[PDB]
Ligand binder design. Structure first.
Ligand SMILES: [Mg+2]
Ligand SMILES: [Mg+2]
Ligand SMILES: [Mg+2]
Ligand SMILES: [Mg+2]
Ligand SMILES: [Mg+2]
Ligand SMILES: [Mg+2]
Ligand SMILES: [Mg+2]
Ligand SMILES: [Mg+2]
Ligand SMILES: [Mg+2]
Ligand SMILES: [Mg+2]
Ligand SMILES: [Zn+2]
Lengths: 155, 118, 127, 60, 98, 24, 87
RNA sequence: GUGAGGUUUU
RNA sequence: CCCCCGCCGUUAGUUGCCAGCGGUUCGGCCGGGCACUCUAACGGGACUGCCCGCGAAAGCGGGAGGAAGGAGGGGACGACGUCUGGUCAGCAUGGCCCUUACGGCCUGGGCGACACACGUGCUACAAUGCCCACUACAAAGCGAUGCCACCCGGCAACGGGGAGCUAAUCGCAAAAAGGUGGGCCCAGUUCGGAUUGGGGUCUGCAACCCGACCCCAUGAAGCCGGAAUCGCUAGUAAUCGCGGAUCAGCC
């Protein structure tokens, strides 16, 4: 079953600048357990996280908190005739985690030759606040609280 | 930036564009430049325009001309069947000839999923 | 300099060496950015010292032997925390309010039968 | 054969392929050891009578 | 002083020499210290239990090499005698080094 | 790569070092 | 990957070379191919177990350092097909 | 106040 | 009740650290320590035990607190029984035939034959990967006809020695991204890759078709896949890194 509270999945108190919120996003950027190649993008790169955004090297994501998180989407449906289980009264932890796993591939899937552009393909989207999670909150997250037909099937 | 060979990889590093010239590889494009003094991290386009033309005779001294040893790929198969050996029809039936398995893996010289009826 | 602190992750034989001096943090023959160079978790080591307004007047070099690299940093976060016996372990108002008093015991789990790499196994076939 | 496969291999041993690294009492030649001589099957029905101490069950 | 390769079967029966030469050599001249531990060389033979119809899930089989050495601080005619005139030949195969 | 003819670890996976990349 | 010692089997090293003493018929029965074919006599026919049965081999002066190991017909592969798949 | 295109016997 | 793990006064002080202060080649090196350090020996070692709420009844939220917590952690462990499931490709045993033989006798071939078709291991779709200066942070089994630093001949695959070891230093091995690196510039491209016929070294009767594949030739396929699968709950995936076991390479 599932009737049990979770674990010590809250990682660790880190030491660089605090900021356990985006160190987990570095854990989303990295693959194959590789360190000192993903943390060089966020920390050791001194020319792409600054000199282009205008200010504020560490807290670029001020714009990438207020209006970028995907929150509200369907869980899972079987043959389940016409439920449309969008609204759901969703959770802030899932709201953060869908951003942390859905704001990743706007730099990996979008390549560029330069070793200073393919990294911080994402930092301009975080500083400006654009990408694939801005139109999605207007497409998917604005079709639940306006009118009246879907289904009584909830849980 | 013209090369010693024929197919130009369009202005890359001297370890890269000079390599896949026929007759040249990793251990010839790596030692053929450190003797002449070119730093292997530089570009073919950023070479000296005299090093463009004087690094061409060094390649064409000993080994046989481009396409001729590629014809010796088909001619060595001819000379091994001096009496019409069994290795000749090991070659000319579309399969690897070392002795790999050919129902699974080593699907290369066979046509990929070409012919079965059932 | 020789203290009670023995922080053993990664089967690292920990011998931590510190006394009141002048420098912030030292290591065996290097200067904290050449031997510890390579992991970002080594840019700020002395968390039990800097957390209690006792930042940088300790020598804090080591003789630690076993395993890899970041368990030495865990032997600073836990090795200094066991090595504060000079700074009076009856001081119970320096490590208690912060979320600090969980000890490093998370070791990598061992390997079993029918198995490649410690709970990775071949799957079902149904034929 | 079943009985005299031991005496079949006791001719002059030639060289370092087709090794006669066989089990002693039965007719096995698989998973023998340079500390036992017996095989993985005969350590089960011989060393678990108490006949061959040393090797035990660890199970940690 | 001298190295003596102590190999016992079980560590209690190896303590029947490592705890008998020592307590038989402390009291009358040419004293002795306790045994330092050599590494127990636990072998690994993790092989299949069943003869034929047993594919995976095999049992661990070890082989424990219990070994120490006792450091005497003076050898003489009343302590080399205590190495070879007392014996409990049930868990002991020792050697004497030079 | 492991399965390559000559890489850094292609000598490790296949057993011996190369005639251009020796031991020392 | 051949070396300075070109090995022929001691069972079959000089018991193929009976021709070079006087001169006899153009056949002699050797067995192996992992042993090197004899370089002393040339031009004649050497009987050998060629993989399937004892059928001879005949050189035509084209071997300088070529290996005889490509002479083994025993897989009489007629062609493709005849599978009866999905089993 | 609510649920199935829906199955065959080895 | 049987151990790993985090874990100590006592710990043996052949791992021994100038940690005091010692002197040194500036490795505790060396002619006393054991104060700080394992292997392996070991007995103490918290228990929702105390408090306040839910309760006639232990289930009882949380606090103190330590090595950890209310089950300290994984692990070690496998009921009465099922499948007339399978084992003579162990052993003994009933039984069919074979004992001038489905036995041995002698060394080439075969299990790696090819056009397929399902899942199991290595596993690149590139600047986040990569032949590339480089030397390290080593958990444990290995190794005296074996490992083989240094010292070699080395474009070397590897001849011939010796250094240390009848077996924790001496040497295994290289721990891997640690590189503060120069670059490979959106590329079907040094990201990536096999089949290939000639030469040079073999440990080995001998490597072909059944040596590792060693610099060489040469590099076909691949930009993340369909009807929804399937190993994974916080030290769990994932590349990376080490040894055996019959062991000469290693398939
Ligand atoms: Mg090309
Ligand atoms: Mg791990
Ligand atoms: Mg039915
Ligand atoms: Mg003490
Ligand atoms: Mg439990
Ligand atoms: Mg069955
Ligand atoms: Mg079944
Ligand atoms: Mg059956
Ligand atoms: Mg293509
Ligand atoms: Mg191996
Ligand atoms: Zn047996």
């Amino acid at each position: 079953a599932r009737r049990r509270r979770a674990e010590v999945r809250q990682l660790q108190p880190d030491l660089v600048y605090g900021d356990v919120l985006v160190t987990a996003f570095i854990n989303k950027i990295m693959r194959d357990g590789k360190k000192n190649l993903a943390a060089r993008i966020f920390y050791d790169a001194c020319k792409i996280i600054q000199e282009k955004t205008g200010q504020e090297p560490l807290k670029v994501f001020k714009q990438a908190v207020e209006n970028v998180k995907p929150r509200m989407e369907v869980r899972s449906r079987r043959v389940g005739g016409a439920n449309y289980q969008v609204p759901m009264e969703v959770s802030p932890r899932r709201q953060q985690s869908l951003a942390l796993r859905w704001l990743v591939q706007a730099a990996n899937q979008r390549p560029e030759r330069r070793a200073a552009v393919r990294i911080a393909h994402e930092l301009m989207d975080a500083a400006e606040g654009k990408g694939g999670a801005v139109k999605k909150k207007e497409d998917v997250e604005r079709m639940a609280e306006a009118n009246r037909a879907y289904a009584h099937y909830r849980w | 930036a013209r090369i010693a060979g024929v197919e130009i990889p369009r202005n890359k590093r001297v370890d890269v564009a000079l390599t896949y010239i026929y007759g040249i590889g990793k251990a010839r494009a790596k030692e053929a430049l450190e003797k002449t003094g070119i730093n292997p991290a530089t570009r073919v386009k950023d070479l000296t325009e005299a090093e463009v033309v004087r690094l061409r005779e060094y390649v064409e001294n000993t080994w046989k001309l481009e396409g001729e040893l590629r014809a010796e790929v088909a001619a060595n198969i001819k000379r091994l069947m001096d009496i019409g050996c069994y290795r000749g029809l090991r070659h000319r039936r579309g399969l690897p000839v070392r002795g790999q398995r050919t129902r699974t893996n080593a699907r290369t010289r066979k046509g990929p999923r070409k012919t079965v009826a059932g | 300099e020789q203290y009670y602190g023995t922080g053993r992750r990664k089967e690292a034989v920990a011998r931590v060496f510190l006394r009141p001096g002048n420098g912030k943090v030292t290591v065996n023959g290097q200067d904290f950015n050449e031997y510890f160079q390579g992991l970002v978790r080594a840019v700020a080591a002395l968390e039990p010292l800097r957390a209690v307004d006792a930042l940088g007047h300790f020598d804090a070099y080591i003789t630690v032997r076993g395993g890899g690299k970041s368990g030495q940093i865990d032997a600073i976060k836990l090795g200094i925390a066991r090595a504060l016996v000079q700074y009076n372990p009856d001081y119970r108002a320096k490590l208690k309010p912060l979320g600090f008093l969980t000890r490093d015991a998370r070791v990598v789990e061992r390997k079993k039968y029918g198995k490649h790499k410690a709970r990775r196994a071949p799957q079902y076939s149904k034929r | 054969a079943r009985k005299a496969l031991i005496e079949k291999a006791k001719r002059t041993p030639k060289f370092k392929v087709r090794a006669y690294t066989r089990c002693v009492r039965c007719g096995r030649a698989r998973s023998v050891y340079r500390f036992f001589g017996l095989c993985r099957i005969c350590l089960r029905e011989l060393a678990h009578k108490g006949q061959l101490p040393g090797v035990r069950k660890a199970s940690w | 002083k001298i190295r003596i390769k102590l190999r016992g079967f079980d560590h209690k029966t190896l303590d029947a020499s490592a705890q008998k030469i020592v307590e038989a050599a402390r009291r009358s001249g040419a004293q002795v210290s306790g045994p330092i531990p050599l590494p127990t060389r636990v072998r690994r033979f993790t092989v299949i239990r069943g003869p034929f119809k047993h594919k995976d899930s095999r049992e661990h089989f070890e082989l424990r090499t219990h070994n120490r050495l006792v450091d005497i601080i003076n050898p003489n005619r009343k302590t080399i005698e205590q190495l070879m005139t007392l014996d409990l030949p049930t868990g002991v195969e020792i050697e004497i080094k030079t | 790569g492991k399965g390559d003819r000559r890489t850094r670890r292609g000598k490790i996976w296949r057993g011996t070092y190369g005639k251009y990349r020796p031991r020392k | 990957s051949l070396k300075k010692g070109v090995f022929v089997d001691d069972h079959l090293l000089e018991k193929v070379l009976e021709l070079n003493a006087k001169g006899e018929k153009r056949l002699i029965k050797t067995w192996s191919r992992r042993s090197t074919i004899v370089p002393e006599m040339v031009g004649h026919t050497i009987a050998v177990y060629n993989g399937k049965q004892h059928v001879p081999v005949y050189i035509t002066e084209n071997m300088v350092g070529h290996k005889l190991g490509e002479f083994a017909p025993t897989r009489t592969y007629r062609g493709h097909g005849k599978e009866a798949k999905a089993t």
